């Protein structure tokens, strides 16, 4: 989170927290209410986000659902929507924590090695998170969509 990152960055430097880092933690502490509102917005409507994003993804990239692709069949499409659900859950964690160390430290480090061992195109996963971002920022107000799109932006950036 923000507090972990500030504590570690002051911790290597053998110093206390600088006052600028302290008002950073203070501003994050005050903005936590809007962060929790964005988290409830993302949590309560996860069904429609995953459904509409999977629909727009398979409309956009039909070869992965065609025979020959990874997510072909009933259980494979269910696992594909499950992976999208995992990434939306990590998006909610990163929205609450105020930083991307939950998202990176859980589901972005060895994502290329894992999806290469599974035989998955990672660009189609980036398109899945892109459609999730489209449905999610179509669901909120302006600054809320920008603050959630920052973390969605980080996930698609960490894909490629």
């Amino acid at each position: 989170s923000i507090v972990t990152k500030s504590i570690v960055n002051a911790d290597a430097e053998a110093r206390y927290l600088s006052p600028g880092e302290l008002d950073r933690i203070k501003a994050f502490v005050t903005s936590g209410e809007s962060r929790l509102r964005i988290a409830e917005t993302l949590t309560g409507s996860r069904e429609r986000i995953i459904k509409s994003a999977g629909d727009a993804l398979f409309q956009k990239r039909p070869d992965v659902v065609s025979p020959g692709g990874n997510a072909y069949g009933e259980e494979m499409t269910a696992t594909c929507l499950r992976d999208m659900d995992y990434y939306l859950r990590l998006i909610t964690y990163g929205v609450v924590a105020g930083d991307v160390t939950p998202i990176e430290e859980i589901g972005l480090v060895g994502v290329r090695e894992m999806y290469k061992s599974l035989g998955t195109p990672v660009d189609a996963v980036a398109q899945a998170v892109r459609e999730m971002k489209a449905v999610a920022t179509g669901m909120m107000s302006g600054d809320d969509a920008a603050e959630a799109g920052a973390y969605f932006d980080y996930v698609i950036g960490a894909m490629e």
Binding site: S1, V3, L42, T43, T92, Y93, V96, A97, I106
Partner: peptide, 15 residues
């Protein structure tokens, strides 16, 4: 915050 997120993640549930 990280412990709350870790509990909700070990559950696999949303917040």
């Amino acid at each position: 915050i990280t412990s709350v997120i870790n509990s909700a993640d070990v559950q696999g549930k949303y917040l």
